[PDB]
């Protein structure tokens, strides 16, 4: 493979940021290209050629070259700026792409808001309870998501989206919801959903 | 007679990017094998047309470039490709009969201080057309405030030149680039091989 | 503009063929090559293939060989990768770019390494479980006493397969304090989704609530009211 460190480089606001392609074999006096992939979009290119940029590429983007390894410039770090970026190369095997390197700026830290949804009257009819945590606006994304019966810990069905997907305000949301039969509902009087953002660990509590 | 190809590859100076400087060679004939011989070109990159074919060919009239950058823009002078050189400095046709040779000219063209005789266009308001040359010096207005001829804040010079080091990198050193246009209009060959 | 177009996403049973096509606009089809990339979910990306649109020549990586098969139709501009016996690793997104090739002195035809433009990507979901309808359940209006300004009104969009299914509140009338949380694939390969909106507690009363859920797939739409409890 080609060496692409690290997995997440992290730069403030205003900072220059550096990313790192080194091979031996595969760069052999070869071209090496950079790209850049925003979250759930197809790659666009950067830099071709670790020196040559093609258009609708700002200035900020600059790139160098150092025998077996090359980098990826941002003098001026935006939050557009934010993506994963890729170096890519020929060698004696087919065209070779980096593991890729994240780039994370700081921002605003938010509160987590949840809300507790208590399982619906049909579904009860069904026969089949649902009982729903929803977790927006919560930025540094990290979250983990605990459902406590009576003040005991249940691991029995929480299924959560533990994949935080971040909203278009940029702030990270989750879902998590614990599937439980009808019964037990009815037969534990207090079921709660508690999460730990940061320190901040938020209960809320619904019963039947 | 015989074409003068020699001469656009052995000319003593070349031009700059900022206006590239092309001859129409016509009426000759030209040995292609005098090109593929020399092992001085770095770049031999033939686009539309197979090299081997040439000789064989017969052309309507055979354009010469000539036109110096630095050696990663190099990449740069070919079809379909997107730059600062490439879109606005000379451009290659996305249908493009022709071939681009390109070699280092660090021994002739770079100085201790700096050759900055040879120049590139930093700034342009369109992209250039295919086979176009602007040598217009007007400040960029790049502010909503004109520029009324002084470089100033959202105010830019249309041209910037390249600092050629011989302790540059090669990147940064200078290469010497001809381009090769073969143009075969609905009219008689006047360019062809010998074989 | 140069403009690649890829097919839509294909949600397709272990062991079928995947068909993925990507239109080509804008440049001569003829005189540059497409090649195949593919990102699993969260992963990098890998390089399956070269096709060449004037040769028709075909190059293909040694992992994905075997399975992958690339071919061109001039007339069309559109390029087809067709892969088959998916495994369940096989699901990703797969892209198509453009490389120029050019010719060596010798005569002999090379790829430039440069990936110049992109398609948009076409997902292939590779699941066991076949096509289940959607069953929304009303979250409803949970007056907690918590607050006059906030309440809680959602919808649980569950058991549905496959994705995606669109959610939208009173026709699009309701766009504000609309948040649709992400998808959970479960245990069961089944979907599930959760939608709510923010709505003052005196509009319970004044105004009704009602979530427009459409499942393509199913061909299914389910437009649930939210009564208070
Ligand atoms: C350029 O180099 C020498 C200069 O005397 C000339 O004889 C030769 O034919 C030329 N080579 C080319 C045009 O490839």
Redo the contacts between chains.
């Keep these: 493979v080609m060496t692409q460190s690290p997995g997440t480089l992290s730069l403030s606001p205003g900072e220059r940021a550096t990313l790192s392609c080194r091979a031996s074999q595969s760069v052999s006096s070869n071209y090496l290209a950079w790209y850049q992939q925003k979250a759930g979009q197809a790659p666009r290119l950067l830099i071709y050629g670790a020196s040559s940029r093609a258009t609708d590429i700002p200035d900020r983007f600059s790139g160098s070259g150092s025998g077996t390894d090359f980098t990826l410039t941002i003098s001026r770090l935006e939050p557009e700026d934010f993506a994963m970026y890729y170096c890519q190369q020929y060698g004696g095997s087919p065209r070779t792409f980096g593991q890729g390197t994240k780039l994370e700026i700081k921002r605003t830290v938010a509160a987590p808001s949840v809300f507790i949804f208590p399982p619906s009257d049909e579904q009860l009819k069904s026969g089949t309870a649902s009982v729903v945590c929803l977790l927006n606006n919560f930025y540094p994304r990290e979250a983990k998501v605990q459902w406590k019966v009576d003040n005991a810990l249940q691991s029995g069905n929480s299924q959560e989206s533990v994949t935080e997907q971040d909203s278009k305000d940029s702030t990270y949301s989750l879902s998590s919801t614990l599937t439980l039969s009808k019964a037990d509902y009815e037969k534990h009087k207090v079921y709660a959903c508690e999460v730990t953002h940061q320190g901040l660990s938020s209960p809320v509590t619904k019963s039947f | 007679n015989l074409c003068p190809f020699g001469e656009v590859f052995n000319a003593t100076r070349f031009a700059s990017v900022y206006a590239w400087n092309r001859k129409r060679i016509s009426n000759c004939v030209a040995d292609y094998s005098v090109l593929?011989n020399s092992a001085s070109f770095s770049t031999?990159?033939?686009?539309?047309?197979?090299?081997?074919?040439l000789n064989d060919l017969c052309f309507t009239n055979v354009y010469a470039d000539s036109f110096v950058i630095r050696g990663?823009?190099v990449?740069?002078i070919?079809?379909?490709?997107?730059?600062?050189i490439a879109?606005y400095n000379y451009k290659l046709p996305?249908?493009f009969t022709g071939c681009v040779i390109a070699w280092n000219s660090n021994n002739l063209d770079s100085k201790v201080g700096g050759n900055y005789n040879y120049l590139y266009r930093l700034f342009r308001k369109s992209?250039l057309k295919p086979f176009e040359r602007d040598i217009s010096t007007e400040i960029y207005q790049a502010g909503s405030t004109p520029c009324n001829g002084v470089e100033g804040f959202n105010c830019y010079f249309p041209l910037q030149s390249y600092g050629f080091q011989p302790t540059n990198?090669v990147?940064?050193q200078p290469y010497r680039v001809v381009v090769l246009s073969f143009e075969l209009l609905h009219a008689p060959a006047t360019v062809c091989g010998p074989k | 503009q140069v403009q690649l177009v890829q097919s839509g996403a294909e949600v397709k049973k272990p062991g079928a063929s995947v068909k993925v096509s990507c239109k080509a606009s804008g440049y001569t089809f003829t005189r540059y090559a497409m090649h195949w990339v593919r990102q699993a979910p969260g992963q990098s990306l890998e390089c399956m293939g070269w096709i060449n649109a004037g040769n028709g020549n075909t190059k293909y990586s040694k992992n994905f060989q075997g399975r992958v098969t690339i071919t061109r139709d001039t007339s069309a501009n559109t390029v087809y990768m067709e892969l088959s016996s998916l495994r369940s690793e096989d699901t990703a997104v797969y892209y198509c770019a453009r490389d120029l090739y050019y010719y060596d002195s010798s005569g002999y035809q090379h790829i430039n390494y440069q990936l110049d433009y992109w398609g948009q990507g076409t997902l292939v979901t590779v699941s066991s479980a076949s096509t289940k309808g959607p069953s929304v359940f009303p979250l409803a209006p949970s007056s907690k006493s918590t607050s006059g300004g906030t309440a809680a009104l959602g919808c649980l969009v569950k058991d549905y397969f496959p994705e995606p299914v669109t959610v939208s509140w009173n026709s699009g009338a309701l766009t504000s304090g609309v948040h649709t949380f992400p998808a959970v694939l479960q245990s069961s390969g089944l979907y599930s989704l959760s939608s709510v909106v923010t709505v003052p507690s005196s509009s319970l009363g004044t105004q009704t609530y009602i979530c427009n859920v459409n499942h393509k797939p199913s061909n299914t739409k389910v437009d649930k009211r939210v009564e208070p409890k």
């Design positions: 593929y031999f990159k033939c686009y539309g047309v197979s090299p081997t074919k990663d823009e990449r740069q070919a079809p379909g490709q997107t730059g600062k879109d996305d249908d992209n990198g990147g940064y």
